[PDB]
């Protein structure tokens, strides 16, 4: 368990990059004598929030399409690569929307289109 698990980050193209880069450079500092949390702290060089809940009780991390949290297990994970929107979405809802549009072209497992709220380039990899 203490051994390295399978790991990855959901979120903003601009947010997720430095986590990946930091992970690559530090992973050798991983050590299976410690706990998973005690190793994460030193590998990713951060501390974790513990259920930041009551402050932002209607901030809407929700789909911004269906406006709901929790679509059939699925969670708002896919975001905008934009400082002014940051508007989360569902994989389901953003595919269903972007399929319709003229602007939207599909490569192999990816769809490029406009973010619904701000009309900036947003990428979806199925």
């Amino acid at each position: 368990p203490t051994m390295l698990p399978e790991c990855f980050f959901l979120g903003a193209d601009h947010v997720v990059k430095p986590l990946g880069i930091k992970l690559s450079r530090n992973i050798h500092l991983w050590d299976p004598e410690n706990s998973v949390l005690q190793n994460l702290k030193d590998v990713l060089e951060i501390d974790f929030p513990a259920r930041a809940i009551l402050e932002k009780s209607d901030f809407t991390m929700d789909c911004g399409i269906c406006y709901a949290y929790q679509l059939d297990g699925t969670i708002p994970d896919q975001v905008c690569d934009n400082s002014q929107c940051g508007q989360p979405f569902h994989q389901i809802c953003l595919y269903e929307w972007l399929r319709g549009l003229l602007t939207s072209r599909q490569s192999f497992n990816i769809i490029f289109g406009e973010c619904p709220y701000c009309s900036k380039p947003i990428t979806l990899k199925m």
Binding site: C63, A68, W97, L102, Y117
Partner: protein, 153 residues
């Protein structure tokens, strides 16, 4: 399913904090349909008017715009007597401008706004649009009488 979540949020947000001079409730007669009301705008011939609307949210909403009719006859360049609205946000693009970024509240706002400022370039009533363009007074008079005939009680 995006229907269910949109309806739940928008219904209660419009029941507690709607935009001013606008109401929207789950039609009692038709609890799949909505009933909307626009109150007669100050400094308009629509002043002293309560304009009832049937607001149907298509089953693909919010990927498709609402289908909304005036139940109240209105004398307007861009709106015929049968209540049909010439407005891009009620149609999919490239012609229209609908997206789930917008909603029932913001489009009822764009409607009240058009009611304030008619756009003569999308004319449903060519007569009303030319009278609006050349003879403001006659339009304002016929429309205000229209408000007191159709939007009164």
């Amino acid at each position: 399913m995006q229907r269910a979540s949109r309806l739940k949020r928008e219904l209660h947000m419009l029941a507690t904090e709607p935009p001013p001079g606008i109401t929207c409730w789950q039609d009692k007669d038709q609890m799949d349909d909505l009933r909307a009301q626009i109150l007669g705008g100050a400094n308009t011939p629509y002043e002293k008017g309560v304009f009832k609307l049937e607001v149907i949210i298509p089953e693909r909403y919010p990927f498709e715009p609402p289908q909304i009719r005036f139940l109240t006859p209105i004398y307007h360049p861009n709106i015929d007597s049968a209540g049909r609205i010439c407005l891009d946000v009620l149609k999919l693009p490239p012609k229209g401008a609908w997206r789930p970024s917008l909603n029932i509240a913001t489009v009822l706002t764009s409607i009240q706004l058009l009611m304030s400022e008619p756009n003569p370039d999308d004319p449903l009533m060519a007569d009303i649009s030319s009278e609006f363009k050349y003879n403001k007074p006659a339009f304002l008079k016929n429309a205000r009488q229209w408000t007191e005939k159709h939007a009164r009680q």
